Amino acid sequence: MNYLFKNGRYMNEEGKIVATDLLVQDGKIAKVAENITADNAEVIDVNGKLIAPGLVDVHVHLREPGGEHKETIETGTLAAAKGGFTTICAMPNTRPVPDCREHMEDLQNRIKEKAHVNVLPYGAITVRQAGSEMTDFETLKELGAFAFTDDGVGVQDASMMLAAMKRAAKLNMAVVAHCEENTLINKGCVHEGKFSEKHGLNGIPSVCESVHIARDILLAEAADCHYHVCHVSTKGSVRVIRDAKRAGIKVTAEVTPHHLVLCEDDIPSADPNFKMNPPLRGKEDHEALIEGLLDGTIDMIATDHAPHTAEEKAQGIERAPFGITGFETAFPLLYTNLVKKGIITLEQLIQFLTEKPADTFGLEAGRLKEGRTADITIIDLEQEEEIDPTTFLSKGKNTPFAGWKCQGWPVMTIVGGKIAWQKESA
Template structure:
C-alpha cells in the first residue's frame, strides 16, 4: 500500500529538521521526503496545519502480561498506545511469571506480533524472579530480542549483583534500567516527605532516598564502564547527580514522566488514589528541576511508566492502593499542554524526548524520518482541545490523575509500519 502525507509540518529531531513538506510511504518504509511529491494510486492524508513526527516511543510501560491480565494485556495496552500516538512501547518484566528467560522473551515478542497493534519491545529481568539474588539469563534474553535489562518495580538492594549485572550487560552494550530509590529510607511511605505529608499526617518517602540510590547506581555503572538508564527521575538531587555524571563521561541516560513534570504533592490533599505513584509526586522545586534537566539534556527522555490497575485495586483507602495509573492515552496531551503551550519546551524538544531519544537509548532504528526508515509516524494537532474521560480509554486501567482535565494537543493519526492504526481517536485494528 502506498501512502502520501501531504503538506504537514515535518519535525525530525535526528536532523533538526523543521519544514513543511510531504512524505511518501510504500511497503512499510519511507521512500521520499520533500515538497510537491505525488503517489500515484496511493492514499493521501492532508496534513496541512498538523505536525508530522517520527512515531512516539514509550520506553517504560507495564502491560501486565503474562499473569496479570485483569489489569492489562498486550491487546489492550498496545491499543491504548496507538490511541495516544505511540508506535513503539517497551514493557517491563515485573509480571507473573517474571520475564527472566529467553522463552518468555520470545513468547512475548510473538504475542506482540499476533495481538499487538504497535511495535512491542521486551525488557528482561536483571535477577531471577526479581528476587535480587542471582542473575537472570541475560545473554539468552538479549539474543532472543530483549532491548534492555531491568528489575524495575523496586530497587535492587544488592550492590554486588548490580555490579556483576552491569559488567555482563556491558558486553552487549545494552542498558540496565534502574528503579533508583533506597527502600530502607523510603520505608513504607505513601507520598513525598515534605510540608504536605506533614500536614496530612501521612508517612513520606524522602527525596534523599532517590538521590542516594541514583548516586550508587551511577557509581557502579561508571566503575563497570557500562550503560545505565535511570527510570522515572523525580528529585532535584538526582537530576544534579546525573548532570555531574554526564560531565564525567559516564554512560548514563535518564527519563522522567509526564506526571512528575506537571503535578506536585499538593494534589494529594484530595486523597485521590490516582495520584499515588512510585516514586511519589514531589514539591514544586523538584518539578522545576526536572524541567530544567530536560532543557539542558541531563534528562534524555519522557516515559509514561504506564501502570494500570484493576478498578477495585485503586478504589480503596489511600494507604492501601497500589502505585501507578494508566498513562499512555494522556501523555502527549499532558506534555503539550503543560510544557509546550507554556513555552517550557519547544516542539522539537518534545518530539526528541518522546521519540528520537528513547530510540537511541534502546538501540532502535525507529524514531527518525528518513528514506529507508520504518514508516512509524505520528500526526499531531497541537491545537486540538479535548477533555480526559477515563471511561473511554482503550486501556483496562480506568484511573488517571488527569481525569476531567482539559488538554490542548492530541495525536490524530498513528501510522505503524506504513499502516494507519489509529485515526481521530479510533483504533482501527
C-alpha cells in the same frame, strides 16, 4: 501498500517545523518533501496537522502475563497507538517474569501475535526479581531482549549490581534501574513532605531514590557500562547525574509526564489517582526536573504506563496501589502545559519522545528518514479537548488529569505502513 499524506507540518533535520508532504511505499518512508507528486497512492490530506515519527515509550507496564485484568498486550498496545506510540518497551515485573528462555519466548509470542504496535521486551536482572540470583543475560540477549532491569523494585545487593553491569557491558547493553533503597521506604504512600505532614500519612524521603542512583553511577563507571535511570523525581537525583555526565560516565535518565506537570502541592486530597512510585515531590524537586530536562541532565521522557482498576484504586491511598495510566495522556498533556506554556519548544518535545529515546538505546526509529519503517503519527494541535477516562482505550482509567483540557491529540497512528489507530472524524 501506498499512501501519501498531503499538506502537513514536520520537523526537518535541523530541528525546525516546515510544511511538507510524506509518501509511504511498502511500509517504508519512500519520499519526504513538498508537493510530493505520486499519482499512484491514496491521498490522505492532513489539513496542516502535525506529521511526526511514531512516539517511542521506553518504559511501559502491559501487565500481561500475570494480571490480564489490569491490562492486556492488545488493549494496552491499542491505547498506546491512540497516544501516538509506534514502539514501546514493556517492563519485566509481570508474573511469570521474563527471567529465562521459556518465559522470554512465551512473551515474545504473545507480542508477535496480539500486539498492535512494536513491543521491545525488557529482560530481567534477577530471576523472579528476587534479587538473589542473576539471570542468563546471554540467552535473553539472543531472544531479542531490549535491556536488563528489575523495575518495580530496586536491586538491593550492591555486588549483584556490579556483576550485572560487568556482564551487560560485555554484551554491549544497558542496565535500567528502579532506584529505591528499601530500608528508607518508611512504608510511605506519597512523598515525605508538606502533603504527608498535613494528612498524617507516612512519606517517602527523596534519599530513598537518590542514594541508589549515586551508588549505581560509581558501579557503572567501574564496569564501564551504559547505565540508565528510571523516572527521576528528586533535586538530588538530577544533581548526582549532572556531576556524573560532567565526568564522562555513560549515564542516562528519563522523567515522567506527571513528574513534569505536577508536584506535591497539586494533590487535592488523599486521592489514589495521585499515588505512584516515585511520588510527586516538592516544587523544589519539580523545578529541578524541569531544569534537568532543559540542560541535558535528563535525556528523555517516558510515561511509565502503570494501569490499574478502579476497584483497586477505590480503597484508601494507603491500601491502594502505585501507578497512573499515561499512554493516551502523554503528548496532549505535555503539549499544553509545557510547549504551549513556553517551558519548551515543539521541536524539543518531539525529540524527547522520538530520536533522543531511540539514540540512547541504538534503535532505527524516532526519525522520519527515507528508507525507514513507516512508524508515523498525525497530530491535531488546534482542536481543544478534555481528558475523559470514559473514552480511554486502556483498561486502566486511573488518571489524575480527568477534566484537564489540552490540544495536540494523536488522530492516526501508522505501524509499519499499516494503520493501527484512527480517531473517528479526520
